[PDB]
Paper text:
The recently identified bacterial Sir2 domain-containing protein, defense-associated sirtuin 2 (DSR2), recognizes the phage tail tube and depletes NAD+ to abort phage propagation, which is counteracted by the phage-encoded DSR anti-defense 1 (DSAD1), but their molecular mechanisms remain unclear. DSR2 contains an N-terminal Sir2 domain that serves as an NADase effector responsible for NAD+ hydrolysis, a C-terminal domain (CTD) that functions as a sensor for detecting invading phages (as discussed later), and a middle domain (MID) that connects the Sir2 effector and the CTD sensor. DSR2 forms a tetramer with its C-terminal sensor domains (CTDs) in two distinct conformations: CTDclosed or CTDopen. Monomeric, rather than oligomeric, tail tube proteins preferentially bind to CTDclosed and activate Sir2 for NAD+ hydrolysis.
To elucidate the structural basis for the NAD+ hydrolysis by the tube-activated DSR2, we incubated the substrate (1 mM NAD+) with DSR2H171A–tube complex, which was obtained by co-expression the catalytically inactive DSR2H171A mutant and tail tube proteins together in the same bacterial cells. We then determined the cryo-EM structure of the DSR2H171A–tube–NAD+ complex at 3.0-Å resolution, in which approximately 60% density was observed, facilitating the accurate tracing of the NAD+ substrates. Looking closely at the four densities corresponding to the NAD+ substrate, the densities representing the adenosine and adenosine-ribose moiety of NAD+ were well defined, while we observed a weak density corresponding to the nicotinamide and nicotinamide-ribose groups, suggesting the flexibility of the nicotinamide ribose of NAD+ when it binds to the DSR2–tube complex. However, we did not observe a clear density located in sites B and C; by contrast, bound NAD+ within the Sir2 domain of DSR2 adopts an orientation with a ~ 90° rotation compared to that seen with a nonhydrolyzable NAD+ analogue, carba-NAD+, which sits in a position ready for catalysis in yHst2 in yeast (Saccharomyces cerevisiae). Instead of being inserted into sites B and C, the nicotinamide-ribose and nicotinamide groups interacted with the small helical domain, with the nicotinamide moiety stacking with residue W60. In site A, we observed the stabilization of the adenine group through stacking interactions with residues Y282 and T52, while residue T248 forms a hydrogen-bonding interaction with the 2’-OH group of the adenine-ribose (left inset). Mutation of Y282 to alanine decreased DSR2 NADase activity by about 50%, whereas the T52A, T248A and W60A single mutants had a negligible effect on DSR2 NADase activity, highlighting the critical role of the Y282-mediated adenine stacking interaction in site A. Thus, we speculated that the observed NAD+ bound in the DSR2H171A–tube complex represents an inactive conformation.
Author numbering:
A (entry chain E): 8 to 42, 48 to 77, 170 to 176, 191 to 211, 214 to 236
B (entry chain G): 8 to 36, 41 to 42, 48 to 77, 170 to 177, 191 to 211, 214 to 236
C (entry chain A): 336 to 365, 369 to 399, 406 to 634, 644 to 786, 789 to 897, 903 to 1005
D (entry chain B): 336 to 399, 406 to 463, 467 to 633, 644 to 897, 903 to 1005
Write the structure that this text describes.
Amino acid sequence: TADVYFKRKSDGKLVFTAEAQTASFSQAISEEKLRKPLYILKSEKEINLTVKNAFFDLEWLAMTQRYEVEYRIYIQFPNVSPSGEFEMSLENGLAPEIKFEALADTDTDEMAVVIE
Amino acid sequence: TADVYFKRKSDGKLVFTAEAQTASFSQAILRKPLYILKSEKEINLTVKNAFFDLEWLAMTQRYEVEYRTIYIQFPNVSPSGEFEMSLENGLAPEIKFEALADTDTDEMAVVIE
Amino acid sequence: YDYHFEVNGTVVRHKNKGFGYMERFFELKEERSKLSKKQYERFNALFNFFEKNGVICMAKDSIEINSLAYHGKYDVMKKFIEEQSVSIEDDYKKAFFLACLGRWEESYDLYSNIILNSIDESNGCVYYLSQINRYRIYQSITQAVTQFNGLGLLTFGRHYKPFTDEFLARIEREMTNFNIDDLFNGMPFEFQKKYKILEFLSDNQFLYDDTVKLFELTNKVRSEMSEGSYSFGMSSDIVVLLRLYDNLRFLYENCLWSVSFHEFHQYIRNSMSLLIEKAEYERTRDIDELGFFMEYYDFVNISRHFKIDDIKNLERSCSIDKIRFGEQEKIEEYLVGIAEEITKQFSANGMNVVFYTQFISEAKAALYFAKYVKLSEEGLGKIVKALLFYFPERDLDIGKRYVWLERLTKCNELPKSIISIIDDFLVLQAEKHQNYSEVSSNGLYSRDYGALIKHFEKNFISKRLSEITLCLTQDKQKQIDFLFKLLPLLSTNAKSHLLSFKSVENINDLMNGIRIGLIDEFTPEHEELIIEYLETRKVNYIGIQTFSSNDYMSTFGIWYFLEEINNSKMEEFIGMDDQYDFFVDPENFDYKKFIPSWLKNYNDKLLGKIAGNKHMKHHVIEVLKERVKNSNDKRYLEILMNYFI
Amino acid sequence: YDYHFEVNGTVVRHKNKGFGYMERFFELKESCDERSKLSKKQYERFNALFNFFEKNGVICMAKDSIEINSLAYHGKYDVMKKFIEEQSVSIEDDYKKAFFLACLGRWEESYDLYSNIILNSINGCVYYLSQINRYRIYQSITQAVTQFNGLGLLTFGRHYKPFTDEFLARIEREMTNFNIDDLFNGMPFEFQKKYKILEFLSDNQFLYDDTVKLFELTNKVRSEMSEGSYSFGMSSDIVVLLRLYDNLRFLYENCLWSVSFHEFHQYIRNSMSLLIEKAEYERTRDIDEGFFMEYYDFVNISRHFKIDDIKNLERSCSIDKIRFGEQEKIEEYLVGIAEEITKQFSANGMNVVFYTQFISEAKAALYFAKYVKLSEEGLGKIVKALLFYFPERDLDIGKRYVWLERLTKCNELPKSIISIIDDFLVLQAEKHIDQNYSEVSSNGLYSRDYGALIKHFEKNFISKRLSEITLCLTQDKQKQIDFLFKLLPLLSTNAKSHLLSFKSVENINDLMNGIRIGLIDEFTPEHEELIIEYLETRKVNYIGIQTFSSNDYMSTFGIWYFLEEINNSKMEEFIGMDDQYDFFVDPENFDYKKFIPSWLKNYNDKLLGKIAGNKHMKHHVIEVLKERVKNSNDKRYLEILMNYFI
């Protein structure tokens, strides 16, 4: 029952807050054939995260009319892309669940930082 | 999609006939001397659309199975009597039976081609 | 729909637009003195109702089922039925108990009389629930009558007719054209306004919502397991458990007969076995860079709502012995109660058929699941005595009953009292042997009981069997060759007396002698007997084929492979069946006929000898690799890792 | 309930106590000598009865392929628009047109058309279905409005408001007090009597019965799979498929909008992915003493499967060994999806309401296209749609590369597709002039991966435009410089030298990029100095909390040391900073209790072989692999175990 804080990457503004529900890090090796030389240690690290009850900041909502995630140990995803996949249900819809995937800039080459 | 005939062991009367629906043959392995190849084999068969013969019914008011497709013969089939009631009324009766093996014969099922 | 109540016990404002009464109510529960006296009393009642039903607090910030039917207190229920019911409320659970002990005619009459007496009902809830339960009892009676006229003839042999034709005709007349779906609509509108939560009980398929929610939760849990994700809040598994317990408690505490139907049984079986599978996955879950234990209630649910085949599937999928079993004293008491009931009913004139059909499926499951629970010597002895002597043989044959007994012995070693009980069982079986045959669906006859006795004692000599053998005469061959399979249990004098009439005439006698240890090396006579049997088998083999499950030929091939047979005449029979050429001439077997399932029958010695051949090891290694990569048996992988056969 | 009709199409006498009318009807149908003795009016009615029974199914009595015809199911988004344009002859033509309007977003127009159809419906079943569909359209409109208000700002970055506030207020006023459950009861008695089969559509949860039946069949199928039993008659898998097709054809053919909701998507995803699991288990059947995907299966998987669902299905069962029939139709469907995406995003944005509904299916179809063989023209169209016009928010650089490389599997990269990759890289380089701009991928794959794919499939490809840009490159634009650095193999020799003029190995990331492209083949003393200096910096920064990131550089250095690529013995000073570095540097004293089995996944043939042949750390890894293979069903740990026996 830990909380995820969404921040706008540029500034300290809070995009929204939610509770971390499911976090999947299915980071393994990719195809071998398609990619004597010095080892590079290729990888296909992926980090998905889901938040159960996310309420968007009122000031951010008013202003709206790159993102960072802080999962509280403390984990931080400097860059996260929220996947906006909307599906409707016959049962009138009420839990707004937000799914986002961690991204990795080429220069930094790091996706998530977990620190005590 | 073959047919199954359930017959009385002694008299040979056909208790009923139905349509074979499922068959599970799962034989697997505390239990220096000569190897005896001890095994614990089980054969279960679930039957569909079983209607009891009028003659045997009126008489009733050991068994054999003959499942003919290529040609299968199960001697000493014990009919399991698990009865459950659905709150939804009922739809055909499903019969399940387990192949039995006599100590002397040691044979549970026979395959005829 | 103003609020949303969740299984955890927290309310969330979902549709309430006006003032939030629950938001203020929870804080008001957490300065209450300013409320009126009547208002204070009503709040006390509301707090008791909410805390008893599990609605604790708001969103921002185990189970105990009290019922004699759930716990199988089949004698306390009888005592309660015997007592004069003071009130209609006490006569509702009394009719439920009457139904729970068979007695469906009495239960139907009692429900009808409750409906008759419920005219002056203050609320009419008892009348509605009695209508539901009477419809359910009529359904059960109809299905039981149909089974008795059908399967009830093959099973039990005879015709039972538990319900008189007059009663059946009367109930059919009363229940004619009774649409249960309309029952809630055909009620006083005050009842419909107040008791809207009971509407779902009316429809003939009222578990569809629960089944659909469990399907969604199962899909979510399986997706989590496949992806390997980690759930943080209340996992879908915990939600499944909470809803399962809520449904069980609501249906049992309110004395609703729909708790005994196949729909609810399957719902509970799927709600469980999804908690168990998820727990097993959690146990065998690899760590990355960045528990569940079964209580008494879980044991009761698995025993009641699981068929033996369902428990077998659960065992196959996940290892249940690695799941720690709690409340083992209560589990042992439950098992002892089941055994006591079975022994009491079948030891004294038998058990009424209507109750037997309901109770045997749960007794078998309880004694099957008793493998993982540790039982005391007294309780274990009671369970064993009930299982062997008094458990009906139409359900547990000799082979399957031995499997039950050995599973019980797994966790708790066989004590002296249990060995005495097994000795009594074997003596009774011997005295049964008349033109009587011991047919077993499992292939594990009474000799396996003696084998278990010897394995757990290695010096046990049964007095009564020895005395019987001393009294054996050549005339009764059935008892002679029954005790021949029990030779290790007999005394030395009994052994000598029995061996007088015991001759190795056919290959079956040789097999029994090898099993009992009388034969340790093949004499030329045994070799000649085996070769002559092979002669006859080949002669009769030579335009339709016949495949049998005797497996004698496989045993001969194994004997040749292990060198226990050193006569080079068996090669003349090569080609009659497979698994014999595999051991006779492994190089020339043409393994395209090889069956991977064979390797499971072999033991450590045979499989090690097969692996060390080095002239047939590579084909079998390929077969094992294919099976391990394709199937999820995990026994093929165990074989491969143990010796890379 | 007088009779029992099941999926295969054979009637069964269930509760008929009087004369058997259905048996006699089938007898008269099969033997048509009698059909003349019938009264002429009765024979004319029997003709229509036979037509209706044969169109739906009901082929004969119990004792004795699916084709769904609808522009909505086939995704004929261009035929549907033309059909909407044409003037409607009849009321049913308006009802189908309103369903099509709802399909192509345009929920305002669909709601208005449904209201008009309700007004003008004075059979009586068209009014019922229009009421249901208008309720569904209102539900979808409300949910989409809520999503755009809350989620839309985050996902798209800008508030959209597809529906005017006046329209939303009007629909809220209209649809209030409209209880869906009572929609059928408040019907003419004749309609209720005749159309009892439509009753299930009235309730707000009409898939509960179908979902429960699918759950029961799934449990049965799983029981057979675990036990290994053999089913002889109509297997539960066939029943599940038949009921899935019945529901799909009934909802789509009758133009019911409930076919677009999450409940039906999940029902279809569970109905499928259970046929697929059972089919995959069928190939692994244990011999003791097939199922293939057609066009309809491909369309169902594309529509009702999320990308994560397809990934899970791939994980559980090897879905590349399943025969994919009707590949011409599948390729036509994929080309239609690609053309629709190109038409949308090539000119003037897109329809946001239609976008939210169609992008999931587009992504699923292009992900699932890995298993189909696509012609060069169709493959080129699909690639161009995926790379140039597919929305950036949906498919990032790494995910888009994964999609393209998956497409490359069945169909090897031709020169036509290589040209599309080349101009995609040229466009990306053009985007690399703003210093703030930087391509970020959730997967961890970038444009260098596209260049590597191009080189792998040609090995002599030279990109004229990227070489031109490199020749134009100057020290001022550093971002273009280091973008072209990772693409050096694509650059020409003159371009190579011109870029290398300003290219220097300043940091460890620069050295790693140089190794990846191929500029570095053996560590010079300067590279070793840089690596050791970075290790000093990391250790100094280490020296009361500990933070572990996902850079993975330390693991790379450890692997280099283990493989003898780096031959300077100063790395042992840093041992203990992070694992997978001690494992390769000093395996003997690693205390493998901290070993992570997942590490073995990242290694390749060379590294895995070296690890296995170490023989001073092979036993611990073999134990880790054995428990991983026993406990888990991954099937990749087993492959590692048996390919090298590590």
